[PDB]
Amino acid sequence: SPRRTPQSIPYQDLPHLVNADGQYLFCRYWAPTGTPKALIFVSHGAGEHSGRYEELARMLMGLDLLVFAHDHVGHGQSEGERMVVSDFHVFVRDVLQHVDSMQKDYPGLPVFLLGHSMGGAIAILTAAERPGHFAGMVLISPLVLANPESATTFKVLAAKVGPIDSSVLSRNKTEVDIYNSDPLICRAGLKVCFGIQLLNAVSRVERALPKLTVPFLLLQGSADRLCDSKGAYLLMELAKSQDKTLKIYEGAYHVLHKELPEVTNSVFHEINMWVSQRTA
């Protein structure tokens, strides 16, 4: 029987990779017509998938970068029980597999990471695992903090064995409508086991910051109810990176690349400038 996505599409008809655990991950590529100047991996957040980055990847491809992504295990069109991971390091391991395959085909090109929310934590842990390997990282509202109340709560619930209000994702109501009707997004409540893995990610990010030296651009909304702006200020202070920049979007919510048009246009522009300056 042919292996199929959770939506029943055969993987033989789609770009994919098989991870170290034998699971198929759905892949996406946005390649320039000419010879690329750099590679960039796009790392999506919890519950979402790589297709959400279509416009951002098309902007990056227009700067002569070869953009690539995959749906993390348990997400989008990739295999695995929905929003379940045996250990958070599976996500990092899989990004490194994809990155190594692309570097084999495009040797000598600098490689960048771009991550949003959990995807940002995966990007930080990926660059920390290989110091000096990546040319830069673009983080949009990365997951770097965990409430001490939610932490002790999840630990007690794990010893024993509710969905997000979409309106907190963005002030752009059309973007909230798109999010609520995308069948590849998991809008279910957090499973206890997955909550424990997000706590593991936050702990690992904390320990990684003294060894994090990759250049980075950090974009954060001041009114983000999912990833408190306090974490962006702490990440700026605690990362050892010699090239670090923070931009705060006053009044903006969590999904900065899908926010009010004035915010989204600035986010696209600032990522374009930052990546353009570091691939010149």
From Swiss-Prot:
It catalyses: Hydrolyzes glycerol monoesters of long-chain fatty acids; a 1-acylglycerol + H2O = glycerol + a fatty acid + H(+); a 2-acylglycerol + H2O = glycerol + a fatty acid + H(+); 1-octanoylglycerol + H2O = octanoate + glycerol + H(+). InterPro entries: AB_hydrolase_1, AB_hydrolase_fold, Hydrolase_4, MAG_DAG_Lipase. GO terms for biological process: acylglycerol catabolic process; arachidonate metabolic process; fatty acid biosynthetic process; inflammatory response; lipid metabolic process; monoacylglycerol catabolic process; regulation of endocannabinoid signaling pathway; regulation of inflammatory response. Changing C186A: Does not affect ability to hydrolyze 1- or 2-monoacylglycerol. Pathway: Glycerolipid metabolism; triacylglycerol degradation. The keyword Lipid biosynthesis applies. Keywords: Cytoplasm, Fatty acid biosynthesis, Fatty acid metabolism, Hydrolase, Lipid biosynthesis, Lipid degradation, Lipid metabolism, Membrane, Nitration, Phosphoprotein, Serine esterase. GO terms for cellular component: cytosol; endoplasmic reticulum membrane; membrane; plasma membrane. Its EC number is 3.1.1.23. Short-term inhibition causes analgesia, while long-term inhibition causes tolerance to endocannabinoids acting on brain cannabinoid receptor CNR1, and a reduction in brain cannabinoid receptor CNR1 activity. Converts monoacylglycerides to free fatty acids and glycerol. Hydrolyzes the endocannabinoid 2-arachidonoylglycerol, and thereby contributes to the regulation of endocannabinoid signaling, nociperception and perception of pain. Regulates the levels of fatty acids that serve as signaling molecules and promote cancer cell migration, invasion and tumor growth. This is Monoglyceride lipase. The gene is MGLL.
